[PDB]
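Sequence of Cystatin-C (Homo sapiens).
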Amino acid sequence: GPMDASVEEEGVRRALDFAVGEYNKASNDMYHSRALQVVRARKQINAGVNYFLDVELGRTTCTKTQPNLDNCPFHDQPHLKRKAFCSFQIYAVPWQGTMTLSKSTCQDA
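Predicted 3D structure, token representation.
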């Protein structure tokens, strides 16, 4: 397409978790950020699958040291939540078991 896709789709959800994981891995934040909301999801199928995700992210109260990232509420202070808007492009070739982040551009939302 890219054609419309939904966070309801297993593949979109796997690409999201992958992208958000790369985002945390790359940041200098002592704390975990998570996706607030996928505002737009699209995918394109050819030699692989390209996912295009527009995502709002926010900072949580869980340190990245946390072995438990299962329950991390966003900050209720806007200058601590620091809401970000991100466009991720994830390239997956599921039948070869690969997934790479082709593009990640994030700024204040």
